[PDB]
Design an enzyme around this catalytic site. Structure first.
Site, PDB file in Angstrom:
ATOM      1  N   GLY A 186       0.424   6.975 -16.628  1.00  0.00           N
ATOM      2  CA  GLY A 186      -0.381   7.542 -15.559  1.00  0.00           C
ATOM      3  C   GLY A 186      -1.203   6.519 -14.810  1.00  0.00           C
TER       4      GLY A 186
ATOM      5  N   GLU B  39       1.873   9.505 -10.268  1.00  0.00           N
ATOM      6  CA  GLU B  39       3.196  10.085 -10.462  1.00  0.00           C
ATOM      7  C   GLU B  39       4.298   9.064 -10.166  1.00  0.00           C
ATOM      8  OE1 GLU B  39       3.993  13.391 -11.773  1.00  0.00           O
ATOM      9  OE2 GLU B  39       1.973  12.817 -12.404  1.00  0.00           O
TER      10      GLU B  39
ATOM     11  N   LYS C 230       8.408   6.941  -7.199  1.00  0.00           N
ATOM     12  CA  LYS C 230       7.191   7.684  -6.917  1.00  0.00           C
ATOM     13  C   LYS C 230       7.559   9.105  -6.503  1.00  0.00           C
ATOM     14  CE  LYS C 230       3.039   7.630  -3.981  1.00  0.00           C
ATOM     15  NZ  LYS C 230       2.247   6.785  -3.041  1.00  0.00           N
TER      16      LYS C 230
ATOM     17  N   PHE D 114      11.981  -2.339  -9.554  1.00  0.00           N
ATOM     18  CA  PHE D 114      11.049  -2.431 -10.669  1.00  0.00           C
ATOM     19  C   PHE D 114      10.929  -3.905 -10.997  1.00  0.00           C
ATOM     20  CE2 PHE D 114      10.379  -2.960 -15.217  1.00  0.00           C
ATOM     21  CZ  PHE D 114       9.399  -2.022 -15.513  1.00  0.00           C
ATOM     22  N   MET D 115       9.710  -4.389 -11.226  1.00  0.00           N
ATOM     23  CA  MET D 115       9.530  -5.800 -11.519  1.00  0.00           C
ATOM     24  C   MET D 115       9.207  -6.036 -12.989  1.00  0.00           C
ATOM     25  SD  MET D 115       9.798  -8.030  -8.889  1.00  0.00           S
ATOM     26  CE  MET D 115       8.388  -9.097  -8.574  1.00  0.00           C
TER      27      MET D 115
ATOM     28  N   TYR E  53       7.786  -7.998 -15.181  1.00  0.00           N
ATOM     29  CA  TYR E  53       6.515  -8.330 -15.836  1.00  0.00           C
ATOM     30  C   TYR E  53       5.326  -7.501 -15.345  1.00  0.00           C
ATOM     31  CZ  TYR E  53       8.987 -12.128 -18.056  1.00  0.00           C
ATOM     32  OH  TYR E  53       9.857 -12.858 -18.830  1.00  0.00           O
TER      33      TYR E  53
ATOM     34  N   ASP F  73      -5.553  -3.538   1.223  1.00  0.00           N
ATOM     35  CA  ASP F  73      -5.992  -3.579  -0.167  1.00  0.00           C
ATOM     36  C   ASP F  73      -5.270  -4.693  -0.928  1.00  0.00           C
ATOM     37  OD1 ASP F  73      -7.324  -2.974  -2.462  1.00  0.00           O
ATOM     38  OD2 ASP F  73      -6.312  -1.069  -2.866  1.00  0.00           O
TER      39      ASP F  73
ATOM     40  N   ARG G  80      -4.126  -6.902  -8.497  1.00  0.00           N
ATOM     41  CA  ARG G  80      -3.732  -5.607  -9.053  1.00  0.00           C
ATOM     42  C   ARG G  80      -2.630  -4.919  -8.238  1.00  0.00           C
ATOM     43  NH1 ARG G  80      -8.840  -5.234  -6.956  1.00  0.00           N
ATOM     44  NH2 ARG G  80      -8.849  -4.160  -4.935  1.00  0.00           N
TER      45      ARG G  80
ATOM     46  N   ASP H 241       1.621  -2.008  -2.636  1.00  0.00           N
ATOM     47  CA  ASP H 241       0.411  -1.222  -2.390  1.00  0.00           C
ATOM     48  C   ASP H 241       0.516   0.072  -3.176  1.00  0.00           C
ATOM     49  OD1 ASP H 241      -1.736   0.270  -1.556  1.00  0.00           O
ATOM     50  OD2 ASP H 241      -1.250   0.243   0.572  1.00  0.00           O
TER      51      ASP H 241
END
Ligand SMILES: Cc1ccc(NC(=O)c2ccc(CN3CCN(C)CC3)cc2)cc1Nc1nccc(-c2cccnc2)n1
Ligand SMILES: O=C1NC(=O)[C@@H](c2cn(-c3ccccc3)nc2-c2ccc(F)cc2)N1
Length: 265
Positions: A20, A24, A40, A82-83, A85, A128, A132, A146
């Protein structure tokens, strides 16, 4: 339905990605190519579809790549690569620093500036930019993403401000003061991202209360050069943190600067 539409059955849906952490978002498999993907889903639909529309216009090796969408019946999906690491912030914090050494850090910064140079050329604004919101793949590949974290993250990273949610310590002063965002406010955030990279993921302005940040910046305070940081890298950070947006370098200039440092190293 356009060229991006893919059949639901092309994707094996597995578990929610990171319990989570990302809302989603699910880890999936693009079966025909044996590739792991991120998916997503939608539990609002307007914003969801607007995101997909933006992503269809973005293609660069250092930006997360849209692979398809499912929009024929709910739940709707946005599917990306999908990455391996995962996110850069946790990556930096957990990595072996002899392996992820100075030349790797320069390489990561170079890739991120390349992504931002592209968004700059396309007249996009990120809004942003932070570690992260970046991802790490094998062979030190880095992609800017993002994740829409302001509404998922718990803690002090994002805090209320102007009735909204801001990551205060990454936010350009004009964005904080007049809610103005531009590619130059992304440049400011990129400077903070350099400091995150330099420190292997420390929280910025460490030990300084959020309440003090804007006033300090207004009075010309800036984070000092991190331990081990090259003067040239620090010069770039300081250029990113010019009070006046027009005084900050372009991502074109930043990328050129990093290209040179990386090759020299
Ligand atoms: C599944 C998905 C759906 C949408 C997106 N969207 C983006 O990453 C993105 C990137 C750039 C923009 C450009 N945009 C320009 C306008 N401004 C205001 C916002 C930015 C928009 C969306 C990513 C993903 N991928 C994603 N999401 C969450 C986690 C992961 C993930 C996690 C761990 C390992 N690998 C991947 N992967
Ligand atoms: O210990 C460390 N301190 C640091 O600032 C970091 C570091 C060391 N070099 C370096 C580069 C070349 C020679 C010696 C050192 N470059 C960086 C760096 C920081 C931020 C960034 F975005 C990209 C790179 N490593």
């Amino acid at each position: 339905y356009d060229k991006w539409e893919m059949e639901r059955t092309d994707i094996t849906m597995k578990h929610k990605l990171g319990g989570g952490q990302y809302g989603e978002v699910y880890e999936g498999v693009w079966k025909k190519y044996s590739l792991t993907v991120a998916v997503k889903t939608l539990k609002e639909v307007e914003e969801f579809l607007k995101e997909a529309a933006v992503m269809k216009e973005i293609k660069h090796p250092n930006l997360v790549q849209l692979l398809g969408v499912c929009t024929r019946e709910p739940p709707f999906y946005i599917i990306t690569e999908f990455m391996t690491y995962g996110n850069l912030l946790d990556y930096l914090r957990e990595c072996n620093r002899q392996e992820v050494n100075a030349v790797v850090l320069l390489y990561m910064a170079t890739q991120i500036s390349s992504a931002m140079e592209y968004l700059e050329k396309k007249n996009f604004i990120h809004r942003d930019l932070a570690a992260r919101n970046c991802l790490v793949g094998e062979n030190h590949l880095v992609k800017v993403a993002d994740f829409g974290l302001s509404r998922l993250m718990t803690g002090d990273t994002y805090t209320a401000h102007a009735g909204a949610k801001f990551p205060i310590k990454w936010t350009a002063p004009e964005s904080l003061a007049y809610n103005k965002f531009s590619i130059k406010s992304d440049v400011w955030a990129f400077g903070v991202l350099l400091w995150e990279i330099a420190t292997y993921g420390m929280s910025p302005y460490p030990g300084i209360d959020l309440s003090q940040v804007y006033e300090l910046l207004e009075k010309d305070y800036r984070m000092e050069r991190p331990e081990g940081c090259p003067e040239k890298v620090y010069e770039l950070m300081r250029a990113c943190w010019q009070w006046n947006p027009s005084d900050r370098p372009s991502f074109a200039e930043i990328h050129q600067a990093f290209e040179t440092m990386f090759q020299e190293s």
